[PDB]
Design a protein around this ligand. Structure first.
Ligand SMILES: COc1ccccc1OCCNC[C@H](O)COc1cccc2[nH]c3ccccc3c12
Ligand SMILES: CC(C)CCC[C@@H](C)[C@H]1CC[C@H]2[C@@H]3CC=C4C[C@@H](O)CC[C@]4(C)[C@H]3CC[C@]12C
Ligand SMILES: CCCCCCCC/C=C\CCCCCCCC(=O)OC[C@H](O)CO
Ligand SMILES: CCCCCCCC/C=C\CCCCCCCC(=O)OC[C@H](O)CO
Ligand SMILES: CCCCCCCC/C=C\CCCCCCCC(=O)OC[C@H](O)CO
Ligand SMILES: CCCCCCCC/C=C\CCCCCCCC(=O)O
Ligand SMILES: CCCCCCCC/C=C\CCCCCCCC(=O)O
Ligand SMILES: CCCCCCCC/C=C\CCCCCCCC(=O)O
Ligand SMILES: CCCCCCCC/C=C\CCCCCCCC(=O)O
Length: 442
């Protein structure tokens, strides 16, 4: 039809523009901004190069093929075009696999969120993934190892006006598992483990950094009291020079209302120390502390750190319920307090920790954990986009007549649109948002 060809022509043209512009933005943001020049972001540029090659050299020739219902670029470009396509998909899932293994080694090391690779070794890995994927992609195609022997396939290879990627059943099976299924199984197994590690490595220091935050300049809390660092109360007095003198005596330097990150962490270690010492020194808190597990012990310190040893000791009925290990009944009474009404988003997190004895309420709150969720989304959307195509790819090897050519090409295009989604997922990071609004002069 005449309205279908123009209507699909316009939407294909918008897909091509969105892939190219989005991916040049990612590549230049990392190239110009020092904050973004990290090992993880070098792997993300490997991924954005494949998406840019897909946008310029792969998607436009696939778009022309559908609108013209024929191949108008000759038998040479047909084989070269299929090779670049295969290479772009192969290098993409293998780099996602490398990101999963790299994040695993980081999360199971004392450095926790830093790669154990140097920026020089990361470049070698990327060139190694690009050279090997080049051999497995260009070589079987240009050597015609992929080629089917039935008459419909044989005639298509001869005529310059035909470019249907016919393959023998042995190539279709072998290249699908080595190019896609092998790195996909490793990535989902290894990255389900990084999430597990992140949640089970959460401590009281990371818990309070989520709840209190981190500010290196004097500010007023909800009580209008002067605070600094990770919830360090300076004074209840409404006087900034009286608050600035309390800093100077605590640090032993003319601070001038500003603290360095190394100084604020020293103040926080002292504050959590005073909290735990206040508990075992109190006759009402010590027995409730002794009857609690490591994570519920964190929830009780969190409370003493915020309201003081004497304030938490006033929660007699709630404390009695925690001692008897009756979490839901402890929760009803804790929720029926002024603590809950004043700071409810922090109170329901501490109350949920008491109900479950898990770190589930503190899940994907830390900046470093939000970063691991973004990577997981990039990984997940790619697999959702390409798995229907790769499933019907091996099903066609089982039974030929099971699926029509129309569904095969539509499921391939769902994979093609993925090449334009990744820049949009990078907007979850504030570092990328800042570079993008700068590059788009907003
Ligand atoms: C069929 O021709 C097309 C017409 C219009 C639009 C797209 C078209 O598709 C062109 C080719 N698409 C390639 C696919 O987009 C990429 O498919 C692969 C990627 C990586 C390894 C692979 N191993 C395999 C073994 C058998 C078949 C496919 C693959 C494959
Ligand atoms: C169709 C084919 C020929 C085009 C493929 C382009 C190749 C040459 C591209 C794709 C991915 C690219 C790499 C992506 C990541 C980096 C990190 C950067 O810090 C140094 C360069 C390096 C290592 C790039 C070098 C060039 C590279 C390997
Ligand atoms: C920029 C906008 C592009 C949309 C273009 C949509 C128009 C699509 C052109 C259709 C075409 O090229 O026609 C091929 C056909 O085979 C001939 O009979
Ligand atoms: C067309 C593909 C072009 C691929 C070439 C792009 C690779 C160069 C690049 O993006 O690197 C930026 C910077 O040097 C990193 O520090
Ligand atoms: C398509 C036409 C090109 C317009 C480019 C554009 O919109 O640039 C302005 C940008 O939004 C800056 O805020
Ligand atoms: C037709 C070619 C299509 C796209 C090429 C766009 C890439 C050029 C932008 C690089 C300049 C820059 O951002 O510094
Ligand atoms: C099968 C091989 C799995 C990859 C090992 C990575 C380490 C791990 O996840 O335990
Ligand atoms: C299940 C199917 C696909 C998983 C998508 C890959 C993303 C990794 C998520 C890890 C996880 O299973 O929690
Ligand atoms: C999801 C929609 C994404 C892209 C639209 C382009 C799909 C073109 C495939 C048409 C299949 C065919 O009729 O041969």
């Amino acid at each position: 039809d005449e309205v279908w060809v123009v209507g699909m022509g316009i939407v294909m043209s918008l897909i091509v523009l969105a892939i190219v512009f989005g991916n040049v933005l990612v590549i230049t943001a990392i190239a110009k901004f020092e904050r973004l020049q990290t090992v993880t972001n070098y792997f993300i540029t490997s991924l954005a190069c494949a998406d840019l090659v897909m946008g310029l050299a792969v998607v436009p020739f696939g778009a022309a093929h559908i609108l013209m219902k024929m191949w108008t670029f000759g038998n040479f470009w047909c084989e070269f075009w299929t090779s670049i396509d295969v290479l772009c998909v192969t290098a993409s899932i293998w780099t996602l696999c490398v990101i999963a293994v790299d994040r695993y080694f980081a999360i199971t090391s004392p450095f926790k969120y830093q790669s154990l690779l140097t920026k020089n070794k990361a470049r070698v890995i990327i060139l190694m993934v690009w050279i090997v994927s080049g051999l497995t992609s260009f070589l079987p195609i240009q050597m015609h190892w992929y080629r089917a022997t039935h008459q419909e396939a044989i005639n298509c290879y001869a005529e310059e006006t035909c470019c249907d990627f016919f393959t023998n059943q042995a190539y279709a099976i072998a290249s699908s598992i080595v190019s896609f299924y092998v790195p996909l199984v490793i990535m989902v197994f290894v990255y389900s483990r990084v999430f597990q590690e992140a949640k089970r490595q959460l401590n009281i220091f990371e818990m309070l950094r989520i709840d209190e935050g981190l500010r290196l300049k004097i500010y007023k809390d909800t009580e209008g009291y002067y605070t600094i660092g990770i919830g360090h109360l300076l004074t209840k007095s409404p006087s900034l020079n009286a608050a600035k003198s309390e800093l100077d005596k605590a640090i032993g330097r003319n601070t001038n209302g500003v603290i360095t990150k190394d100084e604020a962490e020293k103040l926080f270690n002292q504050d959590v120390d005073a909290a735990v010492r206040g508990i075992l020194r109190n006759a009402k808190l010590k027995p409730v502390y002794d009857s609690l597990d490591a994570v519920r012990r964190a929830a009780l310190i969190n409370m003493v750190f915020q309201m003081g040893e004497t304030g938490v000791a006033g929660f007699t009925n709630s404390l009695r319920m925690l001692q008897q290990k009756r979490w839901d009944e402890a929760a009803v009474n804790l929720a029926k307090s002024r603590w809950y009404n004043q700071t409810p988003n922090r109170a329901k997190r501490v109350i949920t920790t008491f109900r479950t004895g898990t770190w589930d309420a503190y899940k994907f709150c830390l900046k470093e954990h939000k970063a691991l969720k973004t990577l997981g989304i990039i990984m997940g959307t790619f697999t959702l986009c390409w798995l229907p195509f790769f499933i019907v790819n091996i099903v066609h090897v089982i039974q030929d007549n099971l699926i029509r050519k129309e569904v095969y090409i539509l499921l391939n295009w769902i994979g093609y649109v993925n090449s334009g989604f990744n820049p949009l997922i990078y907007c979850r990071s504030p570092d990328f948002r800042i570079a993008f609004q700068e590059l788009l002069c907003l």
